[PDB]
Symmetry: D3
Subunit: 117 residues, 6 copies
């Protein structure tokens, strides 16, 4: 995932950051303090950005034509996933964070299926 | 391009970094000193990574579903472009840097067509 | 602009980031929502910082003694430009973003004159 | 792990980067090409640094005073793990990467033990 | 402090950033303007993170096994210091910034004792 | 130095990184191992870049118009200092690192005079 290439990839990197995004949104719903809201927004922005980066890496570096051919909806899936994370940045609703996680879960399954080949 | 969204995008960001990549490759052909080769490799890696990032942003943030439908080759084009940049990271041949620039030019053409549409 | 040196420079890098800064300020005037204001402030800060970095690079790496000798006001111009970007970070008034853009335009003019030279 | 706090942590972040470090050392033994060796060294350094960061975060943010009292050897364990990663940066021997992975496996076990308790 | 190793370290790096943290908390008490509060929070978060990084580096890279043996409370001390910085991130009270500074002073004392010994 | 502004600045930040640069150059003369040379080059590049950044910050953020009016030489001094760091990036000769340190010492002297004025 470092572009050497190293041969090491794991959608878990994207998932873990995305889990932080939703976790932060849930915390924002339990505390309306101004400074907490500012910090939560700043940090959620950072973790969502990292999640997008990890997904972009899988898309650009790991997945190759045969994968996009075998899984015709993969390009759309990853693009919807990163767009879902962008939506999560602009929202405090945990549902947006979950939407991203729903897509990431699918990418993870596809990833491991391709690993068996 | 900052994901606010700010409404400001320009493939020139990717292009300028890609131009440095090719420029560095050309310099590597005119100086075989070990330390220069090391520094050139290190810096080319950084510039290529930035170019990939800029392209990833156009793909994830700027282009929307309507664009991918209007341009069936768009997902593939950006994917091949970032892969071309990965190839340039692993090579000292300016031809690889040029291949990346050629893909970026194709993306640039589509970008501006969607801006006028 | 990577300090190899690669020989590739373009004020466009600083300009695009400064354009985002002003664009964000424009958007902040049309949406008083707390969370949007927070995100806009965070992102404007990041873009302005990148703009300052790009100008610092032109000043430290591209411009050479012969240039400062031929344009006695250059040191001051770049310094005023980066200070204008700092002022934009601390303001939501698009006029501050525009002031930075005006200085960048002055630097861009000098840059290209030294390039044709 | 973002220091909000978000309540989301996983030693997997450190493990994945450490796996890349070892994977790179193994690849370095199969290709003695100068430029590949330069890129591998550069990338291994970056991945090891990220691994150290992730472990530092577990130590500084996740683990609390009670944990250090329950596991008196924990401070030393994490400290030896990060030092092992520093050793891996300075080595092409996959055994150094494995040594870091072994320490991380021990930290992982303690981590999950505390997550249940 | 760069992990080469270069042999150059100084708790001053952590201290300067921690001083900025407290300085910012002091400024936050003299200006309740929303946008200033947002920027101050954003920046305080960044400087505190740098401070934690510098302390993490002293702990992982500079201090060696013999040092932890000679100073049984050192692991705990550095951990309390980084946790104090985390507390400062989540607070506008200058007292939190000062608490971090007090811990850093204790680390600085031990640092120089090990340097002269 | 964070651009809030926080009111906290110290040329020591630039100095310590520049000291690492020279220290690394010293070590490069004592070990000709290829991999060590690669790592030393990579890390020296990073430390020199940080030093340039700290100096750019003093120039763009700390020094104000009155300061430059009192010490016009400041523009040239800082510009020469950052150029000296660029030269140090491209060299293994400790003398280049020392040249940068000498300029930094001159800047440091002026800095403290302005602090006491
Ligand atoms: Ni990799
Ligand atoms: Ni943007
Ligand atoms: Ni360059
Ligand atoms: Ni977190
Ligand atoms: Ni060091
Ligand atoms: Ni500051």
């Amino acid at each position: 995932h470092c572009d050497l290439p190293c041969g090491v990839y794991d959608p878990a990197q994207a998932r873990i950051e995305a889990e932080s995004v939703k976790a932060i949104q849930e915390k924002m719903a339990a505390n309306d303090d101004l400074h907490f809201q500012i910090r939560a927004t700043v940090i959620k922005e950072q973790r969502a950005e990292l999640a997008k980066h990890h997904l972009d890496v899988l898309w650009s570096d790991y997945f190759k034509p045969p994968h996009f051919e075998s899984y015709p909806e993969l390009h759309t899936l990853v693009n919807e996933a990163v767009k879902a994370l962008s939506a999560a940045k602009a929202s405090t609703d945990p549902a947006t964070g979950q939407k991203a996680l729903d897509y990431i879960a699918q990418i993870d399954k596809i990833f491991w299926e391709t690993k068996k080949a």
